[PDB]
Structures are given as C-alpha cells and as structure tokens.
C-alpha cells in the first residue's frame, strides 16, 4: 500500500519502480492482404515506424495465408511513454479499475476510435532497475520474490504517475 511503497522508497529508491515499456497493437486485426494505413495512422501518432507480425495456423477472422502481414505493433520507451500515457489515459475514462492489472503490476486498455477506423489495444508493463540479470546473456539468473512486483506497488504507481483508481 501507500505506507509500503513509501517506506521501502525510504529504504532505497532502487526499490521504487520505473516504467518498463508501453506497447500498442491492433489486436483483433483486420488487414488481410492489402496496405492498411492503420500502420500509417500510428506513424503520425507516435513518431516511429511500426512492425507487422505474421499469423499462424489457419483461421477465419484474419490470418489464413500463414506468414502474412495481419496486424500492427509498436513498442515505446523513455519519455515518449510518459507523454503518450498523458495522452491516452486522459483520453479515456475516469476511475481506473483495480482489475486492470495482472498480478505483477501491469495493465491493459481495450479502446476503439479520410481513414479513421480502428479498434486498438494498449498494454503497459512495469519494472525496477535490476530486472536485467534475468534478460542478460552472461551470468543470467532469475528474480527472487522480493525484487518482484505485486498489485499494490502497481496501482499506487499508476496513481502517483497519473490517475485515481477504482
């Protein structure tokens, strides 16, 4: 809770979290085999080029020609993340929920809306500095439960960052 994250900040700010990253996707996915300028939408929105991601075993909604441009994905770091959050959070409803969250402190939004048709998905995930020793190559090793995140620190971080919750 508040006392918790503030007293372990007092302990040290290395225990205070940062923001890991923010990833946008066209989740449902309706490109097909044409040049959807939903990729062009995000170009102007964010300021750097997206990337496709190809389908898998054959389906009906979209993604039958396995190995086919079907959707769009973008991943953002640093200050761009804060800024686009200030944009989209503000855009969308008051009173962020509590069940926005996975049980590590990461949340997701399912928002929607010449060309302007789009139903999008955003996902934000969090971190604290020493999450590197699990993704690094040399002397790799996994994170104990202390240096891991729970639901509280996530929601409190969301509040302090920008929001009020359920």
């Amino acid at each position: 809770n508040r006392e918790a994250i503030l007293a372990d900040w007092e302990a040290h700010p290395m225990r205070k979290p940062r923001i890991a990253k923010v990833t946008i996707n066209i989740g449902v996915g309706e490109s097909g085999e044409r040049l959807t300028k939903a990729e062009t939408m995000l170009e102007q929105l964010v300021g750097q080029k997206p990337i496709r991601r190809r389908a898998k075993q054959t389906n009906r909604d979209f993604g039958i020609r396995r190995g086919e441009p079907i959707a769009v994905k973008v991943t953002l770091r640093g200050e761009k993340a804060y800024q686009m959050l200030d944009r989209l959070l503000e855009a969308v409803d008051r009173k962020l929920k509590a069940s926005n969250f996975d049980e590590h402190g990461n949340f997701c939004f399912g928002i929607q809306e010449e060309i302007g048709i789009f139903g999008m998905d955003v996902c934000v995930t969090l971190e604290r500095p020493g999450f590197r020793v699990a993704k690094r190559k040399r002397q790799r090793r996994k994170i104990p439960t202390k240096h891991k995140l729970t639901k509280e620190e996530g929601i409190v971080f969301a509040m302090e960052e920008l929001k009020a919750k359920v």
């Binding site: 040399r138 002397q139 790799r140």
Partner: protein
C-alpha cells in the same frame, strides 16, 4: 529441480561462465590459450595450458597493475602479456574469448593486436582489429567536444623501454 529424469547441468553452466562446446573445440588443439576477459572497468588476460586435474596458468596481467576499461588500456595490457610471454620460452597461443560476442572493433581484439605487435605468434586476421584512431585515443578526445594520447605514447614507450 523436480525429481528424476531431471538433468542438473554442470556447475559453471548453471552459473553462466563456461561454454563447453567451444572449450572442446579449443582443447582439440594441443597449444596454449590466450584467455581474455572484460568487465565494465578492467581487462584481464592469461595464458593457460591443460591438465585433467585442472587448468594450469603460466602468466597474468591487469589494468590495475597498469594504474599503478577502454581500448587504450586493452592495447597496453596486450603489450604487457606479449612481452611477458617471451620471457618464459613460448611463442604460440590461440585466442580464447569465452562468451564475449565477436564484434569487430572491440577491446578484446585490441588486446590481440597488442600481443601480436609485442612479438607473440598468435594466428589472426588483420581485418578484425579496431583501427588506430580508436586505439590511440582520438575517439574519446573527439567526443570531449561536447586518456591523453601523449600519455598513451609515453607509457607505451615506457613499456617498450622496460622490456627492451
């Protein structure tokens, strides 16, 4: 670790320090190894030979024994090791870089270049080194416009003077 049919890997592989495939390939040669290691702040070099009870080292040297972390320091420590390897009566060795990726233009191969120049026969290519403007120091001195290469020169000639 969850019962039988679970294979626990070697100590140094669960640690994350040794690559046993590459180790085999290097040991198939019956020649000493010039081992090179890199931290954020120092560089280490050794010359190692094989024993089944445990590898036996013959030589060592260190950037702190220089201070008494960068490409210049790499070259200088290469010079060190190349000049001590002839002291003991061996002019041959093959490069060991463990789990360091082989990018061209790195302090690893700077150590290699130094060891070659200092009179040690290590088989090599000439197109893997870092070029001399990154070696001598023009690179950080060009960055400082937003190690003095004379100092580089002087401690270099100090080493060659010492080991004449």
């Amino acid at each position: 670790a969850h019962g039988p049919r679970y294979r626990v890997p070697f100590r140094r592989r669960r640690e994350g320090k040794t690559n046993y495939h590459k180790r085999l390939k290097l040991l198939k040669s019956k020649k000493p190894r010039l081992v090179v290691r890199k931290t954020l702040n120092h560089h280490i070099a050794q010359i190692v030979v094989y024993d089944p009870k445990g590898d036996k080292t013959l030589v060592s040297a260190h950037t702190m024994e220089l201070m008494r972390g960068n490409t210049p320091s790499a070259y200088l420590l290469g010079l060190l090791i190349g000049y001590k390897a002839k002291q003991a009566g061996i002019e041959e060795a093959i490069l060991d870089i463990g789990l360091h990726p082989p990018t061209r233009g790195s302090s690893i191969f700077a150590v290699l270049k130094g060891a070659v120049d200092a009179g040690l026969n290590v088989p090599h290519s000439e197109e893997i080194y870092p070029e001399d403007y990154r070696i001598n120091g023009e690179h950080i001195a060009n960055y400082a416009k937003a190690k003095l290469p004379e100092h580089f020169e002087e401690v270099k000639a100090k080493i060659i003077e010492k080991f004449e």
